[PDB]
Amino acid sequence: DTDNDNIPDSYERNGYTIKDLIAVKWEDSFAEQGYKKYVSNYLESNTAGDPYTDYEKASGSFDKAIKTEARDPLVAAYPIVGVGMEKLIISTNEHAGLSINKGESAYINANVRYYNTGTAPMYKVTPTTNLVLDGDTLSTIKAQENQIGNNLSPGDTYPKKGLSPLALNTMDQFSSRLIPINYDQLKKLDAGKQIKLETTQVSGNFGTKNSSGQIVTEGNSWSDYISQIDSISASIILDTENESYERRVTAKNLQDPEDKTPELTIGEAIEKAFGATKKDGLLYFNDIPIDESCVELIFDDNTANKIKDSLKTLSDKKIYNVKLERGMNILIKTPT
Amino acid sequence: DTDNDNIPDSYERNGYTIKDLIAVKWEDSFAEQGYKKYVSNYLESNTAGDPYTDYEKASGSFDKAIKTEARDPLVAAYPIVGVGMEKLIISTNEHAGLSINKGESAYINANVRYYNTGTAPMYKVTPTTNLVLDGDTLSTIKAQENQIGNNLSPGDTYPKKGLSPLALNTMDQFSSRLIPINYDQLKKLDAGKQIKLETTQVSGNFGTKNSSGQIVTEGNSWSDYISQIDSISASIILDTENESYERRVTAKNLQDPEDKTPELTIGEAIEKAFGATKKDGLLYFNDIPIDESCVELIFDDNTANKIKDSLKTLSDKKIYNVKLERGMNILIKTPT
Amino acid sequence: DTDNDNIPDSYERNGYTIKDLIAVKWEDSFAEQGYKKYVSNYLESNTAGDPYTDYEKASGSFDKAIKTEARDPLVAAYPIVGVGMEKLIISTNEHAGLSINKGESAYINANVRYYNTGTAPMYKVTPTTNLVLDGDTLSTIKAQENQIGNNLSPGDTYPKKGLSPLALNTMDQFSSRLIPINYDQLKKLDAGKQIKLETTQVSGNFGTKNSSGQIVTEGNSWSDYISQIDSISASIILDTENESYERRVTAKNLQDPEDKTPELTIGEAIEKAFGATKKDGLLYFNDIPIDESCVELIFDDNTANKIKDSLKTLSDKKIYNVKLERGMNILIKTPT
Amino acid sequence: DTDNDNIPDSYERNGYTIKDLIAVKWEDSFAEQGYKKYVSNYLESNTAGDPYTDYEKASGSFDKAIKTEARDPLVAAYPIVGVGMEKLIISTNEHAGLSINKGESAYINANVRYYNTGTAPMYKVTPTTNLVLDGDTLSTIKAQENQIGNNLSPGDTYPKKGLSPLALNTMDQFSSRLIPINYDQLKKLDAGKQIKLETTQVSGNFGTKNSSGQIVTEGNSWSDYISQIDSISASIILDTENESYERRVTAKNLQDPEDKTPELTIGEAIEKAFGATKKDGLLYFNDIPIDESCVELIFDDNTANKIKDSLKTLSDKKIYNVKLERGMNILIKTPT
Amino acid sequence: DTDNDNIPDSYERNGYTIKDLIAVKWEDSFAEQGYKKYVSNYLESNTAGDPYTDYEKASGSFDKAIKTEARDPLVAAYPIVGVGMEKLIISTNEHAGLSINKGESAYINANVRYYNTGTAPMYKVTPTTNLVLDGDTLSTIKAQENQIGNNLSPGDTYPKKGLSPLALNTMDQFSSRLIPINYDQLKKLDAGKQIKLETTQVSGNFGTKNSSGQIVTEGNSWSDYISQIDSISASIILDTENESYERRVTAKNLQDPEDKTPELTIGEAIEKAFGATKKDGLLYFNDIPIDESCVELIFDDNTANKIKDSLKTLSDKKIYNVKLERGMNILIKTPT
Amino acid sequence: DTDNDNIPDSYERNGYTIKDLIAVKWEDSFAEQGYKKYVSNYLESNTAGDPYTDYEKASGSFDKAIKTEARDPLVAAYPIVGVGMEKLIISTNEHAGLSINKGESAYINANVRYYNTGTAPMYKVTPTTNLVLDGDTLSTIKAQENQIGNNLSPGDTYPKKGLSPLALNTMDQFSSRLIPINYDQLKKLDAGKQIKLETTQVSGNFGTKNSSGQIVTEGNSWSDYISQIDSISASIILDTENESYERRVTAKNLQDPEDKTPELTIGEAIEKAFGATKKDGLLYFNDIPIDESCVELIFDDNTANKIKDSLKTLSDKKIYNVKLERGMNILIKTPT
Ligand SMILES: [Ca+2]
Ligand SMILES: [Ca+2]
Ligand SMILES: [Ca+2]
Ligand SMILES: [Ca+2]
Ligand SMILES: [Ca+2]
Ligand SMILES: [Ca+2]
Ligand SMILES: [Ca+2]
Ligand SMILES: [Ca+2]
Ligand SMILES: [Ca+2]
Ligand SMILES: [Ca+2]
Ligand SMILES: [Ca+2]
Ligand SMILES: [Ca+2]
């Protein structure tokens, strides 16, 4: 036990299961009772880089809002949130003779909705959105106390279904100083074009247990864990044309000989990340099969190049048999 | 005693009662003295996810404002509060020749009343209400120091009966910067329509004991416990046409084999949650029977589908004999 | 000694007296020296819910401003404060041609006086008062640093006799942003009606001893103890047509078999709460008798219903012999 | 072990390798498995001046976003960030007769993008940029809460590729007080010239491990480590005409006899800093050779003078065989 | 070892050297290897008054930005910083008929550059500069967050070479309230004269080691160490017509018999402070000799009087053989 | 050793000297080596009331900016600072038709210089100055962050010689809200009179040693030590027509029999406070004799009355032989 996470090294290498809050060896008969087999590394406290260790992830005492796909030590608990924008309303600043003040000529108010995907929940969201109009960033606004939405659960929005979206109209750190806009930009957008909004960063905390049996949120942050997770993991995004899922799977650096991380191919990583039931050698998700022939796979330039290099020296010419290295981005689009 | 909550595992599995602040086994003769039988899990400190453990809930030393229905370890102590709005008054901003300034053309002041349902009290309420007019969110306001109402007890309002409702007219973090509204929206609402208000989130603390014998409120929060409770519990709401009650009951995930949570049907969950006296095999609440034939039951699409699947393989065709799984939403409307 | 408040259980059940800072048994000869007999429960540190325990209350080391009626462990130390309003003065905002600005058309300044009743003193009062005019809450103002009055003793006002009342004219968290009022409301109140003011909540601290021999105020609060006291106690208010007294007496829940609280009738609760000398079987207060025949008793609907149910099965038909349960509200008006 | 960094002095002098989190001696057969040989000093906890020690750097437990070139104890982990500016937009402040207010005659809004080079990431960037126009510093602005960009990873920008740049338009500590500009400067820049922007300083924190197994960011700073690193290290910057790299390598002061730092020439420092594979005695980077003949080397006056003094007494007349002393600045431009 | 700085008293009196982080006696053969001989006092932890002790100064573990001349325990580590001002630009506040508002009639913006001399660096500079015009202090401004420059290294400026100077235009604690100026002063300075700026005080922290192996800056200050150093030390300033150097050397009070400080003449103090190589009995600095005949020496009235008293009773009539007492100010100007 | 300040009671009563940081008995031969004899009390930690004890004062480890006259335990270390005012400049607030706004009709800016006398330095001065004009206090201003001058050494000013005085023009807690003045006061002072300024109180900290070997300033204050020192000490002020000195000497209350303080006459107190060399039985200061015949002595009414009572029963009719009691104020003016 070099890593000191109450898991033996042989257990962490050859497979283990958590039963009655203790680790036991893996046998083939354990799969009939609903158990799972986990493989991790014996030189690190947390394999995936998330703030929970291997034993906390495998036992399932991190939280009760984190999905069961993040119980695997090789799958990182990481929320990916975004902002959906609509209904930009313009307030005229003319004084009634008339008085067309320039510089501060109108005001803009937007309706936003925060959406979360992934596994973990964000307990205090604070997105930073910038407004783009005709290739010109008008402003960059970080959410104030009126726009901070606590306990954004995974899979649902902060303004829930059946509720009107949030309003964003202020710029100051406190709720004052409404967003101004030039007269030239006002006359430009009144003719033909619209204003788009995009997110840049989101800051949020996570819940951790205390020594008194309670959980605590304030003091933690996700901003110091994004840089660690994104550099050692590959990103797989699946679209079912009605919902979307984004997952990060840990990979092994082949050049480093001190990285005793288990090696996963594309198919095993997909099965352990998204959550699927294997039947007749075919992944099936809930009902929709996600094999290579049935669905469409979208890569990047580097991912396609790496797959092309790793496909020339394979006995079996399948995409899912290619070794998964860090930095890959995979998109899986199911047929309609 | 794996969970370390001074309750033995056999006691926690086969039923137990708290007498003289110690746990004892359950016998059939204990029901004649007014005692209750509790079943919990032996692998978790708190079964329902509320910040009080099984022993604290069963003994009854959490607080003296929490209802006796939350003494059961399977019933979570969770307040559900809301905002009732009335009497939106409009202040004209015309200067008297006239001067109709646009952008900031009028002001709105609303009267609000905070209502609490459930079991636990919220010790420092801070609701976040947004105003909707013609499908357009005008503003989203979080309550300031003048609108924060401490010690909102369960079953009653923060402005008590015989008192005028609270006033909401400010937008800034401090008490300044009255709510503006466009001239177009002013002329729109002056003709035919009205302004609605809805709640989005409420943040509040809870009282916990200290090592000095006193209780402490500041430092705790409810926002980190909503996401844990709502993902592992089912929600039952009962209407008596004059008051409403909302309760959350813990359920068991069948796929997870490490969840040693007791299994409850619909009838047992209703009886242990709302509080009822069983007579001739019929639940009776206070006086009004709440059996399946007498009252009306309202489900959702997923709840009705799950009940339809679980009803085809039952020897007795009754709704209350269906196993209760997580995610169900049940509404019970009594006849008038 | 289960409760661990250095009081034995038999002493706490059969009666005890504190002499030389230690507890001794009660004899009939102790009443001739001016001693009192106390009964409490042996399963709780503090019976009445106030932040002082049974031994602290019985010995008399809580404070020296708390009344001797709160020395009894069954009587809670709880201040009830209120605001008396007068002399609303209106400031015109017309600019002299004239200029009648709407929205912010005048200002209001009120004179307030904080009054305290009960036993304990409030060490830092901060009342929250709302102004009602023609059934319309104009504003809700929480007292700022200029309106916070420390060490409000029981039985007297914060602006003492011979001093002009406090002034309330600001709305902002700091001393700025004077209270505005519409032109319509100004012309409405200038004709026939007046503006009333009511209190909604008051936040205040209490003094507790430290380990260094000093007392400390900042850090404590009364807002977390109102919800506990008001749910387990009955309220008795006595009027002598010149002063008023409000007291809370602890009661026993009959359905709960783990509540080992002593049972008190109406007469014993009145005698132990308000403070009276028994002579010829008649309570006498200071000089004015407060028996059922001499004075007038006012109940509520629930209190009268409970008394009617509990009066049909009594051998002696007297009001003071009825068992006192929680939730009762009693008013005692002495004849003039 | 004088320095107390669990590394023996003979190990730290003659070469060592970290295997299974313990230090072992270096043999020639270890290079075939992918291992590296490290040399450090035995009188200091951290040789390069970065906040991580020799054992933390050599083992590789500092962070997972730091590049593998900073695993060497002689290479300092140090981010170098900068600001790229574009799209200065001017807002007129004329009131429409006209009204040309002087002093505050227009406003300027800039679009900025933060770029990071080096090894370590900056976890909370706060650049300080000043605007120069016609040799006149108009203003110096430090980034506010809307312009602070957390977790700026090495090798990429804070507004990532495919996103519009950040907006800078405020001057006050809070988001208010837009940037003013004189009428003379407005008429000066409207004719022929443009406004440039430059960075002056950047403040940022770094992530360090805690005793609870988590990492912490707030409390640390980079501003107290720049002065230590820059005085004892030489700077080498390499340009590949599409990306740039900047590295700092520790050097030895020859006059100080208590500096037991290993001596490195130019070639060894380049190979250990930038990261290169030696083949046939030639450095090759990724594919592009970076030998003295193939690429162009740019020095300063002091660097060229020191190389000229150290080149007259060399048996082999090569640039890479010159001893590297502190204060040198080297630029390596690859051919196109 | 009375002073408890792990240095023996005989070692501290007769000379010592730090080798392998331990103190050893001084021999004449140690000068051939590059070692130095130090003399200090045995009754004080730090002889010079700087926040580093004798052992920390002699070993060289204080910091790596402090010059090697401050390694001597008799030379205090003390930065002397100043502000160089240029390019005062005037902003007219006339409104265009015209409108010449008095009191606030124009604005002034200055360009400043912070320069550091001495040994230690200032880690957070905050200079306090006042503006003088025609013998009238217009304003006194302390630098805000936009004008605070961290890690000002010794020997170089905060806006480095090749960068435009810092801008100073605000007066408020936050970045607001631009500097006003009277119309009389505006018309006075527009005719013939200019505005000068001078520094009054500078506040800055210093870096010290922690128990966790890191260094910490916030919490320390230089303002409590200026008064101690300046009262017990003499100041020597040397000018080479292109750079300037300022040093403080500790002196001994002759009247106090409990001051066991070593006695230094002018020549030994100059050699140990500025740093010089002795050759043929002549100081030589880098190359320029700084003997009494070659260069010009400038004193004050008190310094010249003390030298005149101490020169009448000397066997050898040289300036450098005069005993150096506290309070002396010496200027050394090299020939051009 | 009752007082526990590592000084024996017989040593503290019969005289003692601090040599090699330990206390030794006094002999007549110790005066030839430059030593001093100290007498203190054995029932108090600090005799004079200053925050340094008897051993700290006698040894000389308090600070290095405190004068040697405060090394005596009977002389309190106490700075007396003041403000010298000049150059009140008036800014007109007329708008140019004209516009003479009343209430806020002009502005005043003063030039101030802080001077320190006594022994100890004030490390963060914050004087509170009020402006008097025609017997009317215009305003009372406490110094803000721009006017706070750290490390005010004894004997010199905060704006040193050769520097322009500080500017005072603001009134708000932050640097805003310039000082207004009425039109009536403006026309009153423009004719014949001037505005005077006086100090009322000054708040400042002092430096004390820490357990880590450093000194700390923030957290201490002088405001809690003025009331203790001024009630038990007599004040002697000496004028040499070019500088002034103010000292406080501890006295003994004759009525209290528990005050074991040594008794001092006027001459011994003057010699031990101001610092003088006794020659031929005559005090001589530096060169100017300060005997009763040569210089002029100025008392108050109470001081002259006490001297008249204590002079009738003296064998030798000299002023310096009168016992010095607390509350006396003595002024010593040397001839010109
Ligand atoms: Ca392990
Ligand atoms: Ca592990
Ligand atoms: Ca248990
Ligand atoms: Ca349990
Ligand atoms: Ca007890
Ligand atoms: Ca008790
Ligand atoms: Ca070592
Ligand atoms: Ca080392
Ligand atoms: Ca020593
Ligand atoms: Ca020493
Ligand atoms: Ca003593
Ligand atoms: Ca003493």
Residue numbers in the entry:
A (entry chain A), B (entry chain G), C (entry chain F), D (entry chain B), E (entry chain C), F (entry chain D): 220 to 315, 378 to 617
Question: How is this structure described in the published paper?
Answer:
CDT is a member of the Iota family of protein toxins which also consists of two homologous toxins produced by Clostridium perfringens (the Iota toxin) and Clostridium spiroforme (C. spiroforme Transferase, CST). All three Iota toxin family members are assembled from two polypeptide chains termed the “A” subunit (CDTa, Ia, and CSTa) and “B”, subunit (CDTb, Ib, and CSTb). All three B subunits are presumed to contain five domains that are involved in regulation (D1), oligomerization (D2 and D3), and host recognition (D3’ and D4). Once proteolyzed, the mature form of CDTb forms a large heptameric, soluble structure referred to as the prepore which binds one molecule of CDTa to generate the toxic moiety, CDT.
Still, maps of modest global resolution could be reconstructed for the CDTb dimer (3.74 Å), trimer (4.08 Å), tetramer (4.08 Å), and symmetric heptamer (3.27 Å) which enabled map refinement and model construction. Similarly, the number of symmetric particles in this dataset were not equal, with the heptameric structure ~44-fold more abundant than the octameric form. Although the unique pathway we describe for CDT also results in the formation of heptameric and octameric structures, the octameric structures are present at a significantly lower abundance in vitro when compared to that observed for anthrax toxin in a cellular model (~1.5% and ~30% in CDT and anthrax toxin, respectively). Conversely, the particles isolated in fraction five retained a high molecular weight, suggesting the symmetric heptamer does not spontaneously disassemble upon dilution. Indeed, residues 456–463 of CDTb remain unengaged and dynamic in the structures we describe here but interface in the symmetric heptamer. Our observation that small oligomeric intermediates, but not the assembled symmetric structures, spontaneously assemble and disassemble would support this hypothesis.
